Design an enzyme around this catalytic site. Sequence first.
Site, PDB file in Angstrom:
ATOM      1  N   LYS A  34       7.643 -23.618  32.426  1.00 14.19           N
ATOM      2  CA  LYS A  34       8.615 -24.630  32.895  1.00 14.19           C
ATOM      3  C   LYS A  34       8.801 -25.872  31.984  1.00 14.19           C
ATOM      4  CE  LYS A  34       7.280 -27.865  36.129  1.00 14.19           C
ATOM      5  NZ  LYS A  34       8.145 -28.925  35.688  1.00 14.19           N
ATOM      6  N   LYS A  64      15.712 -30.294  39.143  1.00 16.76           N
ATOM      7  CA  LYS A  64      15.621 -31.107  40.431  1.00 16.76           C
ATOM      8  C   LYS A  64      16.895 -31.470  40.496  1.00 16.76           C
ATOM      9  CE  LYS A  64      10.909 -31.892  40.430  1.00 16.76           C
ATOM     10  NZ  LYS A  64      10.707 -31.578  39.334  1.00 16.76           N
ATOM     11  N   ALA A  66      20.487 -32.373  41.958  1.00 21.57           N
ATOM     12  CA  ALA A  66      20.633 -33.117  43.294  1.00 21.57           C
ATOM     13  C   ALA A  66      21.951 -33.892  43.397  1.00 21.57           C
ATOM     14  CB  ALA A  66      19.416 -34.047  43.519  1.00 21.57           C
ATOM     15  N   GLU A  70      30.411 -29.898  43.166  1.00 25.59           N
ATOM     16  CA  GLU A  70      31.293 -29.624  41.707  1.00 25.59           C
ATOM     17  C   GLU A  70      30.291 -30.106  40.697  1.00 25.59           C
ATOM     18  OE1 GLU A  70      34.220 -29.167  40.687  1.00 25.59           O
ATOM     19  OE2 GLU A  70      34.661 -30.500  38.989  1.00 25.59           O
ATOM     20  N   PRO A 172       3.470 -27.009  42.197  1.00 30.21           N
ATOM     21  CA  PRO A 172       2.736 -27.849  41.258  1.00 30.21           C
ATOM     22  C   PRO A 172       1.947 -29.037  41.847  1.00 30.21           C
ATOM     23  CG  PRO A 172       4.948 -28.640  42.023  1.00 30.21           C
ATOM     24  CD  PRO A 172       4.540 -27.341  42.827  1.00 30.21           C
ATOM     25  N   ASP A 180      -6.350 -27.891  43.777  1.00 26.44           N
ATOM     26  CA  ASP A 180      -7.212 -26.491  43.523  1.00 26.44           C
ATOM     27  C   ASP A 180      -6.356 -25.529  43.157  1.00 26.44           C
ATOM     28  OD1 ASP A 180     -10.075 -25.878  43.390  1.00 26.44           O
ATOM     29  OD2 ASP A 180      -8.942 -24.449  44.491  1.00 26.44           O
ATOM     30  N   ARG A 195      -0.252 -31.357  32.800  1.00 22.81           N
ATOM     31  CA  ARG A 195      -1.328 -32.436  31.992  1.00 22.81           C
ATOM     32  C   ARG A 195      -2.743 -31.863  31.825  1.00 22.81           C
ATOM     33  NH1 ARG A 195       0.131 -37.662  35.502  1.00 22.81           N
ATOM     34  NH2 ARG A 195       0.591 -35.882  37.063  1.00 22.81           N
TER      35      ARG A 195
END
Lengths: 218, 220
Positions: A34, A64, A66, A70, A172, A180, A195
Amino acid sequence: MDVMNRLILAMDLMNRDDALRVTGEVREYIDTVKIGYPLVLSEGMDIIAEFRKRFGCRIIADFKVADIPETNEKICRATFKAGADAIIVHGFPGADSVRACLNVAEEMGREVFLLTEMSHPGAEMFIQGAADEIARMGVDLGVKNYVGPSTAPERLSRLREIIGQDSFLISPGVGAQGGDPGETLRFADAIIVGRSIFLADNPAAAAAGIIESIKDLL
Amino acid sequence: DVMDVMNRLILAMDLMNRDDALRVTGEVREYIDTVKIGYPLVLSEGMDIIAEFRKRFGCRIIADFKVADIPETNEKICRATFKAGADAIIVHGFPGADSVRACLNVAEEMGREVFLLTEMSHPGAEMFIQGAADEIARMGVDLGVKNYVGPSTAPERLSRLREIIGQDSFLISPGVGAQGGDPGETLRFADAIIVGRSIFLADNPAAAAAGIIESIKDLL
Ligand SMILES: O=c1cc(O)n([C@@H]2O[C@H](COP(=O)(O)O)[C@@H](O)[C@H]2O)c(=O)[nH]1
Ligand SMILES: O=c1cc(O)n([C@@H]2O[C@H](COP(=O)(O)O)[C@@H](O)[C@H]2O)c(=O)[nH]1
């Protein structure tokens, strides 16, 4: 989509050299990366082709999306021109905006992932209350790929209920944000990890460790 | 105070071709000193396009990136964007207060500005965004946001947004022209209007910009 080890690397390092080195270090464990705006805005959209050249991995563009329809169309076109296999789109801006993305994806042979609910504390304010309705909108629109939060497994389970077992769900918030791996994979097809891997003292050992912890789920 | 937007008119430069984007922006330079650059152009031509616009034109740059991630990622996006020379960045409010605060914190550290998009101009906005808009706007005010974006296509909603944020806040508004919003009516509430296609797709973008400005002359 066949994600190796059910593990997607979130490559959010902003330095090209570091991003390439760390990805190389964990390449034996993954085949899906990703890539988001931290890396793309720092190093350019050409980084996507460079990842395919070096690693032959699938690339999910986590943008993302948003905007209005158009603009969404143009963003998707530019993203897929760069070689992304899939793009992540917000559902909160409504159905027309999602459909704009679906259209370009169909035209270019790619996939749209619908983000229905987020993993961070702020998601509680507005997103959580809309999430089920956003997921149903995805179903109505024929969306087959979804993103939901590791940090709220009960909410992730509800998302899985709405979309059914046939839909593909990635998640994620694993590791750094507290989710977990094994519990998340009760509901999601694949986990996204950033991370915990790329900032670890030894990224390869971190990736191997996560995989060992879910070995019976692979 | 607030950014001094020439003629109360912001160009939305959403051409994806570098040569065309540069040509059109140059053509309207005498009318506009503030340009909104979004992902269509940035994802096509790179963040260095901000560098090129600054070099070529005497224009402020608003990066319309509708930042909509978790706080960790939002911080990185803002840092990269301001590093490239953007004067301001546009951020979504629907992801919540922590995500907005992350952007504000980076803008403060880096000496730049955040604009909060509280609701949108397209039909889809009715599904989820409109119901949240008043609260998102109020959240902005509570967080100390000074700059806002709201829709020209919904005059009653734009009016309410202006009420919530107060007269001192700075408000810019897209949806003028192609999406049907009226320049003069919009400037009843917004400090500046954003205009894209009705300028950059015109046979004569300069004449198009001049025409819009003529229609709002007594409001300058
Ligand atoms: O709800 C969401 C949606 C996301 O895409 N993400 C993304 O997933 C990644 C999580 O990374 P990390 O494992 O370092 O927390 C980041 O790229 C982030 O932008 C998230 O954390 N929560
Ligand atoms: O609610 C909104 C928020 C926006 O930023 N925009 C942006 O404003 C511009 C509108 O351009 P146009 O005048 O061609 O409709 C586009 O860049 C779009 O992404 C919008 O149209 N509606």
